[PDB]
Design a protein around this ligand. Structure first.
Ligand code: HEM
Ligand SMILES: OC[C@H]1O[C@H](O[C@H]2[C@H](O)[C@@H](O)[C@H](OCCCCCC3CCCCC3)O[C@@H]2CO)[C@H](O)[C@@H](O)[C@@H]1O
Ligand SMILES: CCOC(=O)C1=C(COCCN)NC(C)=C(C(=O)OC)[C@H]1c1ccccc1Cl
Ligand SMILES: CCOC(=O)C1=C(COCCN)NC(C)=C(C(=O)OC)[C@H]1c1ccccc1Cl
Length: 463
């Protein structure tokens, strides 16, 4: 009728009995029948699925405001309750977002995000030197360094990598991601009005997250008791000042609740995905030693062996830059996008999408678009190099998404990827027990997060 066309749904279950192995391949078969915009019933509610670069741009870019709503994730909603950037809607979201930009684009205290990442990179190198070339799983370290960048921005400090209190909270935090992406939580996302009365992963997510909130909560009180309003140290200080100022407005959103959850929001948006992109990139660098060998020769040409890599070096390193883009593209770590909603009844391609309908923008269908990518299932830095060896970007490259919800941390993310990759490869070459030809790139869990398989790697200190 009005909604976009899609397969006919059963009553309670919607189109689930007809869905899968992987949702991505179902969406992909459904696109083959119904085209680039279609309706699927994942449970009783309808979801509009945007496939292809085009549909996604028309929605999120041309009718941006309409498509700037955030879809609820019920597994973590009883913790978040729509606080924090990545979870907020309407005026709360606008204000939280403008404030974060007005804030994190101002690094109150004196040291920049870039300098902090360079410092984390130095600490990483020294720590990896201690391994002496022994086989390791880099999961823990890569979680630790990206957490550390958020800790630095929000709490004004980093943690040592063997800090066992930090590691205990870190284990809890990232276990909450393994759990949110489990079947038991998928089923929960569909039947939460019922299963919330039973035992399950949701009770474990809740407890793990509330335990982290407790420590965030204690850090806020410590910041307040130690505050110098003339020299804010970090995000929390700046936010505490803004609470006072707006103290006389009860339409103001700048309260204690919003602060704990926004902080936990930033860890949640800012760590796992970046960490996993790093872990994926090093899997590709083992798989293709010639690429890693060329990135090293670019590092030596432009940077040298001595001084630390800096962000201005990127513009002079189009090859390494193209390798990073291509790790993000092939890596495809958020394949279905993060769910949106429409904020009003919305006309779109002759269809009507009623307010608050959920919408999935399937970024994967853009990252693999054969219009923009000659060989989409194969690792190829060439995708982002022109005939003169300079970097090119095209409209298929939308790993951070688009429009009003575009990744708030994009520039930080790319700085992390750039400085972590080059400062590591400047100092270490790499070797694994599995030869390149036997290395498998196929995601071990292809859900909302597309996880690379576990592997072991050596970091061999250079010259
Ligand atoms: C490789 C790393 C990252 C990738 C690929 C990534 C990608 C994304 C994507 C796809 C979204 C969804 C946008 C949408 O709703 O359409 C997102 C949202 C977001 N990202 Fe990132 N992100 C990354 C790292 C970060 C970092 C380092 C931060 C900084 C803390 C960050 C902060 C956020 C925030 C706050 C949102 C929610 C924005 C909103 O709803 O307004 N992300 N990110
Ligand atoms: O007696 C004082 C104790 O406190 C010290 O450190 C604090 C630090 O000062 C304090 O900054 C820290 O709080 C961190 C709170 C939030 C943790 C956030 C994230 C960490 C990892 C990824 C997501 C969660 O917790 C530690 C303990 O609560 C140390 O933890 C202990 O060595 C010591 O015993
Ligand atoms: C078969 C289940 O897929 C869904 O319908 C989802 C949905 C379904 O909710 C539909 C709400 N109208 N929501 C979420 C949150 C998803 C997710 O795993 O985040 C935890 C996705 C999702 C869940 C499991 C596996 C893949 C995806 Cl994309
Ligand atoms: C909507 C809040 O969820 C997030 O913020 C998440 C994010 C937020 O950070 C993403 C990058 N900005 N990252 C990851 C990894 C998620 C995940 O489930 O991994 C298991 C997701 C997530 C991504 C897509 C769909 C559902 C979820 Cl729970």
């Amino acid at each position: 009728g009005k909604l976009p066309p899609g397969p006919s749904p059963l009553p309670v279950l919607g189109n689930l009995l007809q869905m899968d192995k992987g949702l991505l391949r179902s969406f992909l078969r459904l696109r083959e029948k119904y085209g680039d915009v279609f309706t699927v019933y994942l449970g009783s509610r309808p979801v509009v699925v945007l496939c292809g670069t085009d549909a996604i741009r028309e929605a999120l870019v041309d009718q941006a405001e309409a498509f700037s709503g955030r879809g609820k994730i019920a597994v973590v909603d009883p913790i978040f309750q729509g606080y924090g950037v990545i979870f907020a809607n309407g005026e709360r979201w606008r204000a939280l977002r403008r404030f974060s930009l007005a804030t994190m684009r101002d690094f109150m205290g004196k040291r920049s995000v870039e300098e902090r990442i360079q410092e984390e990179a130095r600490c990483l190198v020294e720590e990896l030197r201690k391994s002496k070339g022994a086989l390791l799983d880099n999961t823990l370290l890569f979680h630790s360094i990206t957490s550390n960048i958020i800790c630095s921005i929000v709490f004004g400090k980093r943690f040592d990598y063997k800090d066992p209190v930090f590691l205990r909270l870190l284990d809890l935090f990232f276990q909450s991601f393994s759990l949110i992406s489990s079947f038991s939580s998928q089923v929960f996302e569909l039947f939460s009005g019922f299963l919330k009365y039973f035992p399950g992963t949701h009770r474990q997510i809740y407890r793990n997250l509330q335990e982290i909130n407790t420590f965030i909560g204690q850090s806020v009180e410590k910041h307040r008791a130690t505050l110098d309003p003339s020299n804010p140290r970090d995000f929390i200080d700046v936010y505490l000042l803004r609470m006072e100022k707006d103290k006389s407005d009860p339409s103001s959103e700048f309260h204690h609740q919003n602060l704990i959850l926004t902080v936990l929001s930033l860890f949640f948006a800012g760590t796992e995905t970046t960490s996993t992109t790093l872990r994926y990139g090093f899997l590709l660098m083992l798989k293709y030693p010639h690429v890693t060998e060329r990135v090293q020769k670019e590092i030596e040409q432009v940077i040298g062996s001595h001084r630390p890599p800096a962000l201005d070096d990127r513009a002079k390193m189009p090859y390494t830059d193209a390798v990073i883009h291509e790790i993000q593209r092939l890596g495809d770590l958020i394949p279905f996008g993060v769910p949106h909603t429409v904020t009003k009844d919305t006309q779109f391609r002759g269809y009507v999408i009623p307010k608050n309908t959920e919408v999935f923008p399937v970024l994967s269908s853009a990252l693999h678009d054969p219009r923009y990518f000659e060989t989409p299932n194969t690792f190829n830095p060439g995708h982002f190099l022109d005939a003169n060896g300079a970097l090119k970007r095209n409209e298929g490259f939308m790993p951070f998404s688009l429009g009003k919800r575009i990744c708030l941390g994009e520039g930080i993310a790319r700085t992390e990827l750039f400085l972590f990759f080059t400062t590591i490869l400047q100092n270490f070459s790499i070797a694994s027990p599995v030869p390149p030809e036997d290395i498998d790139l196929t995601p071990r869990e292809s859900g909302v997060g597309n996880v690379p398989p576990s592997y072991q790697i050596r970091f061999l200190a250079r010259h």
